Amino acid sequence: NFLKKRLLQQCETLKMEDLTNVSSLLNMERARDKANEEGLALLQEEIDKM
Amino acid sequence: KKRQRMIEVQDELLRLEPQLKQLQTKYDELKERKSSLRNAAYFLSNLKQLYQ
């Protein structure tokens, strides 16, 4: 009963599976992006070192 | 960074071309200037030192 009026207190006043899954996917994406910056930036350091 | 990489390579391509032309000029000028006079001004005067 108190949880149903907790519904009536929050939802009345006021994605998640996509949140968690897509956030993990995008975290792997940011790991891949950090790898991209590691590669591109370092090869830029070597190119402008040349 | 990728656009910066393209710009740096564009500079690196331009730097490579300029350095190649400069080194070609360096070798040509070294050979010509350093060896010509040390051979011509030597020999032409040594021929003068010989004949005259």
Curated annotation (Swiss-Prot), chain A:
This is Centromere protein Q. Component of the CENPA-CAD (nucleosome distal) complex, a complex recruited to centromeres which is involved in assembly of kinetochore proteins, mitotic progression and chromosome segregation. May be involved in incorporation of newly synthesized CENPA into centromeres via its interaction with the CENPA-NAC complex. Plays an important role in chromosome congression and in the recruitment of CENP-O complex (which comprises CENPO, CENPP, CENPQ and CENPU), CENPE and PLK1 to the kinetochores. Belongs to the CENP-Q/OKP1 family. Component of the CENPA-CAD complex, composed of CENPI, CENPK, CENPL, CENPO, CENPP, CENPQ, CENPR and CENPS. The CENPA-CAD complex interacts with the CENPA-NAC complex, at least composed of CENPA, CENPC, CENPH, CENPM, CENPN, CENPT and CENPU. It is found in: Nucleus; Chromosome, Centromere. The chain holds residues 111 to 165 of 268 of the full protein.
From Swiss-Prot, chain B:
It is found in: Cytoplasm; Nucleus; Chromosome, Centromere, Kinetochore. Residues 1-42 form a coiled coil. It comes from the Eukaryota. Expressed at high levels in the testis, fetal liver, thymus, bone marrow and at lower levels in the lymph nodes, placenta, colon and spleen. Present in all cell lines examined, including B-cells, T-cells, epithelial cells and fibroblast cells. Expressed at high levels in glioblastoma cell lines. Component of the CENPA-NAC complex, at least composed of CENPA, CENPC, CENPH, CENPM, CENPN, CENPT and CENPU. The CENPA-NAC complex interacts with the CENPA-CAD complex, composed of CENPI, CENPK, CENPL, CENPO, CENPP, CENPQ, CENPR and CENPS. Interacts with MLF1. Interacts with PLK1. (Microbial infection) Interacts with the N-terminal domain of Kaposi's sarcoma-associated herpesvirus latent nuclear antigen (LNA). Component of the CENPA-NAC (nucleosome-associated) complex, a complex that plays a central role in assembly of kinetochore proteins, mitotic progression and chromosome segregation. The CENPA-NAC complex recruits the CENPA-CAD (nucleosome distal) complex and may be involved in incorporation of newly synthesized CENPA into centromeres. Plays an important role in the correct PLK1 localization to the mitotic kinetochores. A scaffold protein responsible for the initial recruitment and maintenance of the kinetochore PLK1 population until its degradation. Involved in transcriptional repression. Belongs to the CENP-U/AME1 family. This is Centromere protein U. The lineage of its organism: Eukaryota, Metazoa, Chordata, Craniata, Vertebrata. The chain holds residues 315 to 366 of 418 of the full protein.
